[PDB]
Amino acid sequence: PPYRVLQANLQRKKLATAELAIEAATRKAAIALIQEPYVKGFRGVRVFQSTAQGDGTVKAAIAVFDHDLDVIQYPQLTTNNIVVVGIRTRAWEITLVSYYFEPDKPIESYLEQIKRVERKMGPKRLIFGGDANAKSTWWGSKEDDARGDQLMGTLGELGLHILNEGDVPTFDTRYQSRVDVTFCTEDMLDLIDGWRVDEDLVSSDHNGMVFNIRLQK
Ligand SMILES: [Cl-]
């Protein structure tokens, strides 16, 4: 009965999104928190995207593979960097968010978007996943850079808790790093487990991640 979630930065690779589809089928995943999707493989899959750019570029999206899962969109909260979507079942109602922060753009405006989502969406049932392009030992990075610090500060103000674990690089090229973060409201801990990094849930310099949403009660 666990709702499995996939988190991955596809880097606009046509192949990576094919791999993502294959992994979701295999793992029987219900959700995918995506960043940098390309522009096919997703048939009866509902996809919710962040505001598209002139050339059609979408930086974040949320794929729902579970055909019967109740979904609710929040156009007011979705931007060019984040997409917010609620999922509902008898057991609960969870607001999900997939985000992507450019490595060469001020993180400040993105932190405000996180705040806006948190306040205008209640202090409970929140799960965020994406590429923050920010380093912090709190999520296994080699060190705490200034971006990681700003993000951590924001997390602290919102009561958001890091789900990351281990030191497996979420980005490998050599050059390895952990810039992808997953965090949630306090109440979500106890409903989430199995957070791990698929050594290669894909093939686009970024490593996919996986975790479950249960009930335990
Ligand atoms: Cl790192």
Specify the CATH superfamily of domain 1-217: Endonuclease/exonuclease/phosphatase (3.60.10.10)
Output the CA–CA distances (angstroms, integers) from residue 61 to 10, 37, 187, in the order listed. Answer: 11, 7, 24
Q: Which residues of 79-98 are buried (b: 16+ CB within 10 A; e: fewer)?
A: bebbbbbbbeeeeeebbbbb
Q: Output the CA 164–ligand 1 centroid distance in Å.
A: 13
Please identify which residue in the block is written with the tokens 């109740």: 70
Around ion ligand 1, residues with a beta carbon closer than 5 Å are 135, 141-142, 177-178
- Specify the 3-state DSSP secondary structure of 157: helix
CA distance 28 to 198: 15
Tokens encoding 141: 């990075």
Q: Output the CA 52–ligand 1 centroid distance in Å.
A: 29
Q: Which residues sit opposite 129 in a β-bridge?
A: 98, 182
Q: Output the CA 145–ligand 1 centroid distance in Å.
A: 9
Instruction: Name the E strands within the chain.
Output: 3-9, 31-35, 46-49, 60-64, 70-73, 82-88, 93-100, 126-131, 161-162, 171-172, 176-177, 180-184, 192-197, 209-213
Q: What is the resolution of this structure in A?
A: 2.4
